[PDB]
Design a protein around this ligand. Structure first.
Ligand code: HEC
Ligand code: ZNH
Lengths: 108, 294
């Protein structure tokens, strides 16, 4: 695709050091600061159950495919204005590719 | 001896849809010429213009304000703290030769209302009736606030505009829009990532980021974050002051409350000094381009 595909082992330590603190990937996993990313891909924005999203994340309603997903991670607040995802973003394309490769396999 | 009573007069034979069409013209040009200042657009600088023409009001002797449309005269135009706004005027000029009947102040203020609404912000009630006043009632430079100061200054400064704790904390959130240009005021950088969309970003950034103090290329000091953002000393003063901190924290969790407080506070600012007759029309609430088909 547009975004290619990287190492999923390097994507595992990018998540553990930059995303685990607020997100959990496992099935039926607990929401903490941010939602449980299980089956995030193919699913619309703002639709994981039992989590209270900011109205911005729900009225954006995009279908998370690995392309708009990379446009999100590079600068979250520019993509979804008013989002409470307190993050600067991943500015390097391999870090994005390495991470989404892991996220697509871990979020299946 | 009393100050000046500026009685509001509706422009000769006009009403709602005449003003709605002035909205749609500024709104159409807002979306079509969105190349400006590296794709932020003209939106933020128009609200900054509706504030800088309104913030020249002093309650004691009711001088200045949005009424007279006194930005057009050199003295107010070339105010040091009024730098960069020229482009905001340049924008509104071709629309002022499309509607020569509307007053300069009535149009300047309308520019901010239409800027915020088009930027997906709250719908702000607007009133007409401002009349153009001559060159000698042009306010003298320095009335606008100074960025390099603290909590006590912003409180006492805003007392002049008849704004309280709740109101100044609501008015400052307009800083979620645009950026500070070093060529204009000696400060650089945005307050958030979404520059052209009106949200509660300003507060969420104020409390969730890690702020450090540093000097810039025009040797003024400012607060900067790792994510590449910035806050003025007058902006960071909103979380030093314990009374302002509670209101910042409140607007952070509930955007709707902020949206309602901002419209009340923004309208009041643009209506300051104006004394409306009770045969004047009830405030106009305009429909955005998204609701009006486009
Ligand atoms: C906490 C400080 C966070 C970190 C670290 C990361 N994210 Fe996040 N994320 C967080 C919140 C509070 C929210 C909800 C935002 C809102 O406005 O409601 C989110 C959301 C997401 C989503 C969207 C979920 C959906 O649409 O259903 C995704 C895809 C997401 N976050 C991804 C993500 C990744 C991969 C991160 C690491 C690099 C990351 N986030 C970190 C909070 C926080
Ligand atoms: C205290 C107080 C205060 C202060 C000091 C300030 C300051 C300021 C400055 C310095 C700037 C920059 C300029 C340049 O260009 O550089 C701005 C901007 C600004 N601003 Zn703000 N402000 C304020 C308030 C305010 C308010 C109240 C409002 C409204 C409502 C505002 C809105 C604004 C805006 C929107 C902007 C942006 C613009 C652009 O970017 O374009 N603002 N400011």
């Amino acid at each position: 695709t547009e975004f290619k595909a990287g190492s999923a082992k390097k994507g595992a330590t990018l998540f553990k050091t930059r995303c685990l603190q607020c997100h959990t990937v496992e099935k039926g996993g607990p929401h903490k600061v941010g939602p449980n990313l299980h089956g995030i891909f193919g699913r619309h924005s703002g639709q994981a159950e039992g989590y209270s999203y900011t109205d911005a994340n729900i009225k954006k309603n995009v279908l998370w495919d690995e392309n708009n997903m990379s446009e999100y991670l590079t600068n979250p607040k520019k993509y979804i204005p008013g989002t409470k995802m307190a993050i600067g973003g991943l500015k390097k394309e391999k870090d994005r590719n390495d991470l989404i490769t892991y996220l697509k396999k871990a979020c299946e | 001896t009393t100050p000046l009573v500026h009685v509001a007069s509706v422009e000769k034979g006009r009403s709602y849809e005449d003003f709605q069409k002035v909205y749609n013209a500024i709104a159409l040009k807002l979306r079509e010429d969105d190349e400006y200042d590296n794709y932020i657009g003209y939106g933020p600088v128009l609200v900054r213009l509706a504030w800088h023409t309104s913030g020249t009001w002093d309650k004691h002797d009711n001088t200045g304000g949005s009424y007279g449309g006194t930005y057009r005269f050199k003295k107010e135009f070339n105010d040091p703290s009024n730098a960069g706004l020229q482009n905001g005027f340049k924008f509104l000029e071709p629309i002022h030769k499309e509607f020569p009947w509307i007053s300069s102040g009535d149009l300047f203020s309308l520019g901010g209302v239409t800027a915020v609404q088009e930027m997906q912000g709250p719908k702000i009630p607007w009133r007409c009736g401002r009349v153009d006043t001559p060159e000698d009632t042009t306010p003298d430079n320095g009335r606008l606030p100074d960025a390099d100061k603290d909590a006590d200054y912003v409180r006492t400064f805003f007392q002049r505009l008849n704004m309280n704790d709740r109101e100044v904390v609501a008015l400052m959130g307009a800083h979620a829009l645009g950026k500070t240009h070093l060529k204009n005021s000696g400060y650089e950088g945005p307050w958030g990532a979404a520059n052209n969309v009106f949200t509660n970003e300003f507060y969420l950034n104020l409390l969730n980021e890690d702020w450090k103090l540093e000097k810039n290329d025009a040797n003024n000091e400012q607060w900067d974050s790792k994510s590449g953002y910035m806050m003025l000393p007058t902006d960071y003063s909103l979380i030093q002051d314990p009374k302002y901190l509670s209101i910042v924290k409140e607007y952070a969790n509930d955007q709707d409350k902020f949206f309602k407080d901002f419209s009340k506070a923004f309208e009041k600012l643009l209506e300051n000094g104006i004394t409306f007759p009770k045969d004047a029309p009830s405030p106009f609430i305009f429909k955005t381009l998204e609701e009006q088909g486009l």
